[PDB]
Design a protein around this ligand. Structure first.
Ligand SMILES: Cc1ccc(CN(C)c2cc(C)nc3ncnn23)cc1
Length: 127
């Protein structure tokens, strides 16, 4: 029933880059999903205590959220775009694992994920 530590957003010994793909992931992909009407549930780690979801972190062992992704991108935590893309996919997947088809939160995830997919479809070539 307790919350875990959040995912890491800082690790000074992890090597870092700011690729044109990673910039796109911040300026286009994150910005698009962040501003969306359905962004709010996904803008920070799931608070299992406040939300009374005592089994959340029994089920979800790789938590992820856009608050975490936003800090990662802004703090240049990644080496490549695929790390970040995986973070987004992990976020959507967790929601689908924990919840049921047609739940409100699932329809929100789905709307954000459709947009995610449309933006990632135009990820620029690595320059
Ligand atoms: C429509 C809706 C439904 C549930 C919540 C609670 N909350 C912030 C989240 C957020 C996320 C991302 N997954 C969740 N799985 C169950 N609750 N929950 C917020 C909004």
């Amino acid at each position: 029933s307790m919350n875990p530590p959040p995912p890491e957003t800082s690790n000074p010994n992890k090597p870092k880059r700011q690729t044109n793909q990673l910039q796109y992931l911040l300026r286009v992909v994150l910005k698009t999903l962040w501003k969306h009407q359905f962004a709010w549930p996904f803008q920070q780690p799931v608070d299992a205590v406040k939300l009374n979801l005592p089994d959340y972190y029994k089920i979800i062992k790789t938590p992820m959220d856009m608050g975490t992704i936003k800090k990662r991108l802004e703090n240049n935590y990644y080496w490549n775009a695929q790390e970040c893309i995986q973070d987004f996919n992990t976020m959507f997947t967790n929601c689908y694992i924990y919840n049921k088809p047609g739940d409100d939160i699932v329809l929100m995830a789905e709307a954000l994920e459709k947009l995610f997919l449309q933006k990632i479809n135009e990820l620029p070539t690595e320059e």
